[PDB]
Each structure stands twice: as structure tokens, then as C-alpha cells.
Write an enzyme that holds these catalytic residues in place. Sequence first.
Site, PDB file in Angstrom:
ATOM      1  N   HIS A   4      -8.502  -4.374  -0.853  1.00  0.00           N
ATOM      2  CA  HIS A   4      -7.164  -3.841  -0.520  1.00  0.00           C
ATOM      3  C   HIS A   4      -6.557  -4.443   0.755  1.00  0.00           C
ATOM      4  O   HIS A   4      -5.361  -4.621   0.860  1.00  0.00           O
ATOM      5  CB  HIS A   4      -7.209  -2.303  -0.443  1.00  0.00           C
ATOM      6  CG  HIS A   4      -5.863  -1.660  -0.277  1.00  0.00           C
ATOM      7  ND1 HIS A   4      -4.825  -1.842  -1.178  1.00  0.00           N
ATOM      8  CD2 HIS A   4      -5.387  -0.839   0.686  1.00  0.00           C
ATOM      9  CE1 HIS A   4      -3.773  -1.158  -0.766  1.00  0.00           C
ATOM     10  NE2 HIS A   4      -4.094  -0.521   0.347  1.00  0.00           N
TER      11      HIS A   4
ATOM     12  N   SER B 246       0.863  -1.204   0.000  1.00  0.00           N
ATOM     13  CA  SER B 246       0.000   0.000   0.000  1.00  0.00           C
ATOM     14  C   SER B 246       0.889   1.241   0.000  1.00  0.00           C
ATOM     15  O   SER B 246       1.656   1.433  -0.921  1.00  0.00           O
ATOM     16  CB  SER B 246      -1.004  -0.041   1.169  1.00  0.00           C
ATOM     17  OG  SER B 246      -2.019   0.939   0.985  1.00  0.00           O
TER      18      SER B 246
HETATM   19  C1  LIG Z   1      -7.434  -5.529  11.032  1.00  0.00           C
HETATM   20  C2  LIG Z   1      -8.414  -5.584   9.853  1.00  0.00           C
HETATM   21  C3  LIG Z   1      -7.706  -6.116   8.605  1.00  0.00           C
HETATM   22  C4  LIG Z   1      -9.545  -6.562  10.238  1.00  0.00           C
HETATM   23  O1  LIG Z   1     -10.285  -6.967   9.095  1.00  0.00           O
HETATM   24  P1  LIG Z   1     -11.637  -7.854   9.197  1.00  0.00           P
HETATM   25  O2  LIG Z   1     -11.419  -9.245   9.808  1.00  0.00           O
HETATM   26  O3  LIG Z   1     -12.275  -7.954   7.826  1.00  0.00           O
HETATM   27  O4  LIG Z   1     -12.592  -6.993  10.168  1.00  0.00           O
HETATM   28  P2  LIG Z   1     -14.178  -6.865   9.912  1.00  0.00           P
HETATM   29  O5  LIG Z   1     -14.413  -5.739   8.915  1.00  0.00           O
HETATM   30  O6  LIG Z   1     -14.839  -8.135   9.426  1.00  0.00           O
HETATM   31  O7  LIG Z   1     -14.641  -6.501  11.421  1.00  0.00           O
HETATM   32  C5  LIG Z   1     -14.096  -7.128  12.564  1.00  0.00           C
HETATM   33  C6  LIG Z   1     -14.164  -6.189  13.770  1.00  0.00           C
HETATM   34  O8  LIG Z   1     -15.385  -5.426  13.781  1.00  0.00           O
HETATM   35  C7  LIG Z   1     -16.199  -5.823  14.883  1.00  0.00           C
HETATM   36  N1  LIG Z   1     -17.614  -5.971  14.536  1.00  0.00           N
HETATM   37  C8  LIG Z   1     -18.152  -6.808  13.597  1.00  0.00           C
HETATM   38  N2  LIG Z   1     -19.493  -6.637  13.619  1.00  0.00           N
HETATM   39  C9  LIG Z   1     -19.807  -5.697  14.556  1.00  0.00           C
HETATM   40  C10 LIG Z   1     -21.011  -5.141  14.987  1.00  0.00           C
HETATM   41  N3  LIG Z   1     -22.175  -5.520  14.428  1.00  0.00           N
HETATM   42  N4  LIG Z   1     -20.996  -4.183  15.990  1.00  0.00           N
HETATM   43  C11 LIG Z   1     -19.804  -3.796  16.557  1.00  0.00           C
HETATM   44  N5  LIG Z   1     -18.628  -4.351  16.098  1.00  0.00           N
HETATM   45  C12 LIG Z   1     -18.629  -5.284  15.138  1.00  0.00           C
HETATM   46  C13 LIG Z   1     -15.650  -7.165  15.351  1.00  0.00           C
HETATM   47  O9  LIG Z   1     -15.865  -7.319  16.721  1.00  0.00           O
HETATM   48  C14 LIG Z   1     -14.177  -7.024  15.049  1.00  0.00           C
HETATM   49  O10 LIG Z   1     -13.618  -6.287  16.125  1.00  0.00           O
HETATM   50  P3  LIG Z   1     -12.074  -6.439  16.633  1.00  0.00           P
HETATM   51  O11 LIG Z   1     -11.184  -6.475  15.383  1.00  0.00           O
HETATM   52  O12 LIG Z   1     -11.766  -5.287  17.561  1.00  0.00           O
HETATM   53  O13 LIG Z   1     -11.986  -7.749  17.368  1.00  0.00           O
HETATM   54  C15 LIG Z   1      -8.961  -4.163   9.520  1.00  0.00           C
HETATM   55  O14 LIG Z   1     -10.061  -3.800  10.338  1.00  0.00           O
HETATM   56  C16 LIG Z   1      -7.907  -3.080   9.621  1.00  0.00           C
HETATM   57  O15 LIG Z   1      -7.884  -2.231  10.745  1.00  0.00           O
HETATM   58  N6  LIG Z   1      -7.019  -2.988   8.626  1.00  0.00           N
HETATM   59  C17 LIG Z   1      -7.163  -2.104   7.490  1.00  0.00           C
HETATM   60  C18 LIG Z   1      -5.861  -2.010   6.693  1.00  0.00           C
HETATM   61  C19 LIG Z   1      -5.082  -0.809   7.175  1.00  0.00           C
HETATM   62  O16 LIG Z   1      -5.521  -0.077   8.089  1.00  0.00           O
HETATM   63  N7  LIG Z   1      -3.924  -0.558   6.580  1.00  0.00           N
HETATM   64  C20 LIG Z   1      -3.519   0.842   6.433  1.00  0.00           C
HETATM   65  C21 LIG Z   1      -3.752   1.301   5.004  1.00  0.00           C
HETATM   66  S1  LIG Z   1      -4.119  -0.149   3.986  1.00  0.00           S
END
Ligand SMILES: CC(C)(COP(=O)(O)OP(=O)(O)OC[C@H]1O[C@@H](n2cnc3c(N)ncnc32)[C@H](O)[C@@H]1OP(=O)(O)O)[C@@H](O)C(=O)NCCC(=O)NCCS
Lengths: 347, 347
Positions: free
Chosen positions: B327, B140
Site C-alpha cells: 500500500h 488511500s
Molecule cells: C515514510 C515511509 C513510507 C517509509 O517507508 P520505508 O522506507 O519502507 O521505511 P522502512 O519500513 O524500511 O523503515 C525505515 C525507518 O525505520 C528505521 N529502522 C529500520 N531498521 C531499524 C531498526 N532495526 N531499529 C530501529 N529503527 C530502524 C530506519 O532508521 C528508518 O527511520 P527514519 O525513516 O526515521 O529515517 C513509511 O514509514 C510511512 O510513515 N508511511 C506510511 C504511509 C502512510 O502513513 N500513509 C497514511 C495512510 S497510507
Amino acid sequence: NRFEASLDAQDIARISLFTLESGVILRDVPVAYKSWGRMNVSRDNCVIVCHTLTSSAHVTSWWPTLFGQGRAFDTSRYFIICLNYLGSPFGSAGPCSPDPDAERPYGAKFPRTTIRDDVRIHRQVLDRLGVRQIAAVVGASMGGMHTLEWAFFGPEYVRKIVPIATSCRQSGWCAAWFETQRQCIYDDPKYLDGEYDVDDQPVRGLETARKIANLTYKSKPAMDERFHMAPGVQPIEAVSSYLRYQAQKFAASFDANCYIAMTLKFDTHDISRGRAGSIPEALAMITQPALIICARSDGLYSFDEHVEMGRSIPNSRLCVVDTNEGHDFFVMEADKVNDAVRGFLDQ
Amino acid sequence: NRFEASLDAQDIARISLFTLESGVILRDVPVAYKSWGRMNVSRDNCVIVCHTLTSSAHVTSWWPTLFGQGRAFDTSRYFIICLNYLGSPFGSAGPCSPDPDARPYGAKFPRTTIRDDVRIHRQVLDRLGVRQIAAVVGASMGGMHTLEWAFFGPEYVRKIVPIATSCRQSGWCAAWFETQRQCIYDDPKYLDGEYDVDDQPVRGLETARKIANLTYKSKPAMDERFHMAPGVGQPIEAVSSYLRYQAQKFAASFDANCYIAMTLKFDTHDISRGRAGSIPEALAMITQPALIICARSDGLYSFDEHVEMGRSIPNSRLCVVDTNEGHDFFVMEADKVNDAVRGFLDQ
Ligand SMILES: CC(C)(COP(=O)(O)OP(=O)(O)OC[C@H]1O[C@@H](n2cnc3c(N)ncnc32)[C@H](O)[C@@H]1OP(=O)(O)O)[C@@H](O)C(=O)NCCC(=O)NCCS
Ligand SMILES: CC(C)(COP(=O)(O)OP(=O)(O)OC[C@H]1O[C@@H](n2cnc3c(N)ncnc32)[C@H](O)[C@@H]1OP(=O)(O)O)[C@@H](O)C(=O)NCCC(=O)NCCS
């Protein structure tokens, strides 16, 4: 209602009692519409156009090249009609229209309405006008959802459908994009739980909702053509101004409560619910000839889901428009959409 | 600096004077970094990892499975190092760091480029005695640094692994990131960047992250996570809660000025500027073996632009990860990323 005031002349049908599928009853219900052309004597040359999320019934204003002699919406052959959806600021019952139980508009208290509610009350208006048979329904995006719902009246009342750039039911992707947009409104301090003065809108909320929506309507290649860096040895700096202009224009001309009411309609869209055990099985009940129009570059309504429509509607043809415009293609490539629709109506 | 205070122990190099490519001179410059493993006698087993927009230098916290014996970042074979970008809250000079001429820099931290980061990072490596770099790996934003590292030439940088990234700023990404920055600019708590560090423009940050989060996913990934019930979280109603949770989590753990400073780096990214007349010509100057890793479902950095990298870099291999994640795949499909990276480093 300053939104409705801004429009060209249109008609209003008033429905004295209407039962929403929730069971909530609306009273003294205006339904705005605009028609072009004249019914034949059989009253069977009616073409319904279904409008988009933020437009009025005046389809000519964003689809002008689809109207006229030899065009898709040929007013020498067809009675063309478009009706304003419930929830909209443009004449039909919604947040901006007078609340009969105090008159004061409904405001934040306008009841939830579904795609099916709109199709039902719109048909009551067509019955009032004496329409005997519908030659075609045509609608893009939100209007493609209404279009698919119209089809279920069956092939004797609805002869053909043209769903464009649309879906058979709500998806998590679109639900997430539109909820993000609503939250912008909810988080604006001017929103006041929907109790804002109509001339003091949650403008930041509306603006941000537009910027987001606009980008989901385009594509990477379309935005890259519009804004790009200079060769190493239209500019990127212009993006800011473009975003502010797009957003401000929308925020000056739409109502926040209506934007909430109407996008929430997306969440209850599902042609299968109460009817069939799956989407493919509901599609199979669509017996009319169908022309399904889409673009591969649409980032909200996928090519695959249009292919699924084509597979399950027994008498259907899929028209893939060659374009990089994204969801906005049905307006940008209006000539290609015109020709496709006209050629299908001619069959 | 509460952001830097939250981290595991790390090192700081102090650069007394640094000239940004703008000509602005930074004084008494901290550069934070974290390393794993040990240099060999030749000091030529260095692997640089380039981090993402809102991460620190502690790669183990979001790429933990790429580390260890037999993994990509094998600390028995390599000296692995990641350095914190300028503009970040996590140790390197940025809005949260002390201003030697005053108080932190705050809103007055000078603009920096991808090239500035690479330049000052190589100065640190020279101080550490790194004689040669075995590979540089980044996803990224880190993929942009990775392409810029390659220009030091094949004698200093032996291999590159750009992942999910671009060769220059596009109108598409510039529009998404400018929209996110406007959320912050339009938050009344932002105060032109003069906010107290414990009274952040939290609404702006929340909304910026909701938007970013969705651009990092795909339609299929969101449609698996949230869907409607069959005709006759995971329900559509749970989307609201999900968006609020994601947003708040980010807004509590990042700085608004730093978000601005870092995303603005994207806008000046262009590996061809000053160097070549076009992107394909700049890529042709990359003489190291390259492994380009991408997913078709990435909504920000297109499959096509990675295919372009593969076509113009003379010694390159394209790795397309089979995934529907968007992504975010480089973090969700870490095992497939590990295996591809390790296979390439083994060559
Ligand atoms: C870490 C990451 C990859 C997780 O991806 P993911 O598994 O697809 O996460 P989801 O979108 O399915 O959601 C999971 C989280 O949302 C929460 N969630 C799901 N449904 C929910 C609801 N109905 N109400 C409240 N929270 C909820 C889950 O508890 C989980 O929480 P936790 O991670 O604190 O344990 C992502 O969230 C992230 O922060 N990375 C993005 C990439 C990035 O920031 N890079 C920088 C530029 S690319
Ligand atoms: C009408 C529409 C299709 C136009 O598409 P487009 O031609 O691709 O528009 P662009 O994205 O290229 O932007 C052009 C507009 O921004 C303006 N603009 C461009 N660069 C600008 C800049 N740097 N600063 C300020 N304004 C700028 C132009 O003036 C133009 O405005 P105008 O049409 O009012 O004169 C689209 O803007 C629209 O109104 N809505 C599309 C969504 C839709 O119709 N569907 C509703 C739900 S699906």
C-alpha cells in the site's frame, strides 16, 4: 495446569534426559501424545500428524472429518499419532509444566526450543512405542515446518510427506507479524516479565495478539463476505463484536508464556541451516514423495514459496486448493484437504 | 494545539455554520488549507490534492518530488491546493480544535463522513473563486475523497486520479481499523477520550501504528528488509527494534481521539449510498476521464477492486505500478506516480 486439564484423555511419555540443540539439558521431560488405530505387525503403518501453534495433540477437535474409514486418517489402515510440541500448554514440557529443578512450573524460564528439537524428542517417543517406519507425515502451518524437518530422517524411515500452507525457513514478513503479537503481551502490565499468576494472564495482550493473528489467517475476500455494507439504495457495525468475541475466546484458553515460547520457534526455522548453502539445495535433499498443499489466498505463506518447494523437491506434486479462505483454508476446506491426502496415501 | 503548532504556515477559512449530513450543526468552523502556485485569469487551473489519514495539508512533506516545473504538481501551470479533513489535528475542526459551545471538542467531536469533507472543502474553494477544477488527485483515504469529488460532475471537476483506494468500506479494512481502534480503547490512559493531550494513550497509538504499518507493506517488501543468514536492520533479530521505532515515532506526533474520528470515516464511505443500487452503477455515473493507480502487492486495497473501477468508469485508464512495496507504494514509488499523473494531466 488448567490447559492440560481441559483436554480429553491422552498419553504421556517421560524422557529422563533430553539435550536441546542449544546444549541446554531438560530433565524428566513429559511428551504428550494421542494416537488412533493400531500398528500392523511390521509396525510400518504409522502416520504422524503435526499440530498447529495453539492446538493440542487432539487433531480430531479441529480436523474431525479427516478421520475414519475411507478418510485420510483411516484408523482401519494406519496407526495415527500426534505429539504435543515443547513449549505448549497441552501436556508436553513447557512454561506450564513442572520445573524439576524446584519441584513450581518453568514459567518464563522455559528454555528456547526449535522445530528440530521437537522432531528429535518426538522420534524418541516413536522409538519407545516401537514404530519401525513412518508411512507419512502430514502437517499444516507450523506443523508443515516439523513435516519438512521429519523428511530429513530420509526415505527409509519417512516414506512420504504432506507439507501444507507452510515455509522452509522464517521470513521477515512472518517474523514481523509474530513479533508484533508478542509485543502486545510484553506491553500488557499484567505480564510482569512472564512472572504473572497463571489465573491472572496478560489478557489484553493475548486478546490483541489473537485479533491480529486471525486477520493474517484470513483474506480480503473472506472478510468481505463475512462483513459488508448494505446496497446503496454481517453488517460493518458487527465487526467490533466479532473481534472481541474471537479475542476473548483465545485469551481464556491459552497461556501467554507458551504463546511467546512457541512463536519464537518460528524464528529459528530453516531447513538449510547446518545442512546446505541454500534453501533450494536443502529441498533437493528431500528424497521422499511430497504432496505440497497451498492456497493462492494465503497471506502469510505465499503461493510462490510453495512453488519453490515443488521445484526443488525432486519427487513432488503441488496441490493448489481453489478457495478464498486465506491461511485458514486447511481447516475450512478440510474435505478437499482430506481427498488430496487420501489420494496421495493411496498411491 | 501542539499538532497544528508544529506545521509550516498555512491558511484558515472560517465557516460560521456547517450542517453535517447527520444533521449535527458545526459552528465557527476552521478549515485549514495550503496552496502552491497561482490561479490563472479564468480561475480554472485548480488541482486539488487529497491527503492521507495521518498527514496534514502540507503535501510537500511526504510527496516532495511531485512538486515543481515539469512535475505533476507544476506550480507554473496550476493552482495546487490541499485542505485538511474534519477530525484531523492539523488545523481543520476536530477533537483538538476549540469547541464554540464550551476547551477543545475532545471526545465529543461529531462524526463526519468523506462526503462532509468534500462538501465543506468545496465551500472554501467557492470563497477562493475557483471556477473549475482541472484535476483531483488522492491516494488511500484521499482516493475516497477523490471519487466523491467526481460526483460534482465533469463541468466542475474535469479529471480524477484515484490511487490505492476503494469505492466503499470493506469488511477487511473495517476489521483492521477497528482492531487498531480497540488498542486505543483498551489503553488505560485513554480514559474514554478524556485524556490530557500531553498524556496520550501512547501504548494504544503505538500498537495501532505497528499494525497499520504492516498492512501498508507486503511480504516481499518485509522479506527484503529482514531476513535470515544463508544456511552454511536486516537480520531477523532487528525486527523488534524496527517495530518499536516506527510505533513510538507515530505515537509522539498524532492524537488518539483524532485517530478514532478519522478511521471511523472509512466506515461510512460508499459512493453508491443514496445514489445507485450498486457500486458498478455508481462508478458508471463518473463521467470525467479517470486515471486509476494501483499496485498488485497492496494488501488493503486490492488489484481486483481497481480493475472493477476501470471496468465501470466509462472513460478510465488503469495504471498498475510495477513494485513490490504494498500500500505504501504511492509514497515509495513517487517518481512513477509523478510520471503517471503528469502524463494524464498533459492529455
Ligand atoms: C515514510 C515511509 C513510507 C517509509 O517507508 P520505508 O522506507 O519502507 O521505511 P522502512 O519500513 O524500511 O523503515 C525505515 C525507518 O525505520 C528505521 N529502522 C529500520 N531498521 C531499524 C531498526 N532495526 N531499529 C530501529 N529503527 C530502524 C530506519 O532508521 C528508518 O527511520 P527514519 O525513516 O526515521 O529515517 C513509511 O514509514 C510511512 O510513515 N508511511 C506510511 C504511509 C502512510 O502513513 N500513509 C497514511 C495512510 S497510507
Ligand atoms: C475455527 C476457525 C477456523 C473458524 O473459522 P470461521 O468459520 O471462518 O470463523 P469466523 O471468522 O467466521 O467467526 C465465527 C465465530 O465468531 C462468531 N461471531 C461471528 N460474528 C459475531 C459477532 N458479531 N459477535 C460475536 N461473535 C460473532 C461466531 O459465533 C463464531 O464463533 P464460534 O465458532 O465459536 O461459534 C477459526 O476461528 C479458528 O478457531 N482458528 C483458525 C486459525 C487456526 O485454526 N490455526 C491456528 C494457527 S494456523
